[PDB]
Write a protein that binds this ligand. Sequence first.
Ligand code: HEM
Ligand code: D8H
Ligand code: H4B
Ligand code: ZN
Length: 411
Amino acid sequence: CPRFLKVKNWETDVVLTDTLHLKSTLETGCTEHICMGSIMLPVRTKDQLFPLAKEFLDQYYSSIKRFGSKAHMDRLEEVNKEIESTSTYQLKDTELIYGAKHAWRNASRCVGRIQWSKLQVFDARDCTTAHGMFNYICNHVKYATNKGNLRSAITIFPQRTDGKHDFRVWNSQLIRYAGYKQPDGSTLGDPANVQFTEICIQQGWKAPRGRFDVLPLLLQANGNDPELFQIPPELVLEVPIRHPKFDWFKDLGLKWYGLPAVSNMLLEIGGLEFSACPFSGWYMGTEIGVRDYCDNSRYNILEEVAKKMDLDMRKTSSLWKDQALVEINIAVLYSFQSDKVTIVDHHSATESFIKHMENEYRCRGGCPADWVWIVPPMSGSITPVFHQEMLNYRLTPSFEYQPDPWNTHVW
Ligand code: HEM
Ligand SMILES: COCCCNc1cncc(CCc2cc(C)cc(N)n2)c1
Ligand SMILES: C[C@H](O)[C@H](O)[C@H]1CNc2nc(N)[nH]c(=O)c2N1
Ligand SMILES: [Zn+2]
């Protein structure tokens, strides 16, 4: 802008002023001579820990307008001494909830953040076993699902200590379908999960060898060998995909699960690392309809579908893929709604995100947003976020990526 940063919506000419980026700690990958905005992915000593701890506490106490208080100050000595003795420290329940809700709030890749303050935090820091993990996770799933009226939730397992005793949910999501490679060449189910399916089988999973087989949970507690568990099927809500007009759509036998629940990410609060912190909300229809169903590397159903629309697949210029994609996504939304399972369309979601974005600038002086991820993978320019300039930067607490457990743990 003039002296501090401005973003603009070119459809509405609204301008917003960003000051929040000046708090940004972490680094983006971009430099003054290269932009890495479209790049997917650009323990800790005692000494590294206290700055990060104090930085978080200062923020937490500044959030409740008690910055610089006795409570604030004693808490600082309290934690400083915890780190000398024990090389770590423990978050109060209140701080844990603040941290978690704010990690969501700072998640620059998430279009749903208008919901950020409405999150259930299940503290599972007392868990010591894979079995306990299974119990916490089942409870999360059942709570979150809520018989179709979805509720946002996260379950936080014990924090990392010496890198030799961390909790990992080896699953990328709590609920995902298996993927089966064949020397036939082809692949049955979800190909994103083929290797993971292999690990499960090479750990004794009795694979039904079907298309939409819900995978077992594979749970690592205290750094031990991970252990298999079948989520109770009655806890796994699913939607058969049919079309509001094309009654032949049922015949494709599509089904998806209703509960999107990410389980491979790392939650960072006050320098502490929670390597097992599965979290869930509800689906934007395009996640299933466009990416899950139509990505070439995923279920890849575009050919099968468009074929059954008497479509012109001779050349790409008929836009037969575009047509099939729109129908597939209509069927997804219709289905979830006919089943009274929470879902949002990309028009409504992006619309609420603009509102949220403007909310955040009003009261927080900004909102970090990653345009590349915020814009839906179909019909981009007819949603409001396509035309909205966005500033991306890294605030903390945060959810981070982390290595796949099978490329580390062994024995
Ligand atoms: C309530 C409904 C929610 C909706 C509609 C929603 C929507 C989305 C969408 C569409 C994406 C992009 C995913 C993709 O295209 O692969 C995403 C990413 C993400 N969401 Fe949200 N979300 C919701 C709830 C939550 C919650 C409860 C959390 C955590 C507290 C969260 C944190 C994140 C994070 C960390 C990412 C980035 C994933 C990555 O970088 O791989 N979201 N969200
Ligand atoms: C490939 O490396 C990065 C992995 C991409 N992340 C990613 C992939 N598929 C699905 C997701 C689900 C994201 C999500 C999470 C939540 C809590 C809700 C929602 N609607 N969507 C995330
Ligand atoms: C290359 C590019 O960064 C990558 O394909 C991104 C683009 N935008 C995305 N946006 C969402 N919501 N989800 C994704 O997986 C991706 N993939
Ligand atoms: Zn950049």
